[PDB]
Every structure is written in structure tokens, then in C-alpha cells.
Design a protein around this ligand. Structure first.
Ligand code: HEC
Ligand SMILES: [Cu+2]
Length: 106
């Protein structure tokens, strides 16, 4: 999918997590976010289209998604333990990273 679509998936599923009634619902949303993060990691964002594919900026962009997956995996572990509120709280740690990448590269 394109980068915009993967971003919509990330945004929509974070809202699902916030409104969830159980940890399995959180897990289902996080699973979709994990895939969207890894698919977005394959894209070249418009603001970096003129940079080398091997540039420090492109590696920083790609590594931002690895860190999003770090947080998603943290939250998934908690969700799979049935810990709904803790999994929701772990997912909120994503937000600073959504905004930090946007500040650089959106
Ligand atoms: C870089 C490592 C990113 C991370 C982490 C997140 N996003 Fe992102 N997002 C990124 C870029 C470069 C762009 C612009 C894409 C473009 O083609 O202009 C975006 C955009 C969004 C949007 C707007 C969607 C659109 O239709 O353009 C949303 C709603 C969005 N991003 C959400 C979002 C969330 C919730 C994230 C954390 C869970 C997140 N992004 C991380 C780059 C990066
Ligand atoms: Cu972090």
C-alpha cells in the first residue's frame, strides 16, 4: 500500500485501541499497525524523494518504523497477557514518535 494509506491505517487503529473494551481488540488493532508500519517503511516519503536511498535521512526514516514496531511489540505482549489498560497505555507511547517523524519528514 502507499504511504498515505498506511498512515491512515496507523491512525485509525490507534483510535480503535483507545476505545477498546478488551485486550484482544487491542491486539487485533496492533497487528494491523505492525503490518502498516513495515509497509510504510518501504516507501520513500515525498520530502526525501531527492535524497540518496542510502542517505542518513532515509535510514533515520526507516529506523523510525523499527522503533514504532518496538512499541507495538511491547503493547502486543501486554495485550496477549489480557492486560487491557496496560496495553492501551503502552500504545500511547507511540504518539510522540508519530509526531517526531512528521516534524522531520512530513
Ligand atoms: C516516519 C518514521 C513516520 C512515522 C513513525 C509515522 N508517520 Fe505518519 N506520516 C509520515 C510521513 C512522511 C507522512 C506524509 C505522507 C505524505 O505522502 O505526505 C505521514 C502522514 C501521516 C498522516 C496523514 C495521512 C495522509 O493522508 O497524508 C497521518 C494521519 C499519519 N501520518 C499518522 C501517523 C500515526 C498515527 C503514526 C504513529 C502511530 C505515524 N503517522 C507515524 C511518516 C511517519
Ligand atoms: Cu520510544
Amino acid at each position: 500500500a502507499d504511504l498515505e494509506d498506511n498512515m491512515e491505517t496507523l491512525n485509525d487503529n490507534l483510535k480503535v485501541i483507545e476505545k477498546a473494551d478488551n485486550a484482544a481488540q487491542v491486539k487485533d488493532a496492533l497487528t494491523k499497525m505492525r503490518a502498516a508500519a513495515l509497509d510504510a517503511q518501504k516507501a520513500t516519503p515525498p520530502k526525501l524523494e531527492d535524497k540518496s536511498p542510502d542517505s542518513p535521512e532515509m535510514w533515520d526514516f526507516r529506523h523510525g518504523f523499527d522503533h514504532l514496531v518496538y512499541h507495538i511489540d511491547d503493547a502486543l505482549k501486554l495485550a496477549n497477557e489480557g492486560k487491557v489498560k496496560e496495553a492501551q497505555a503502552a500504545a500511547e507511547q507511540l504518539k510522540c514518535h508519530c509526531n517526531a517523524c512528521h516534524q522531520k519528514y512530513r
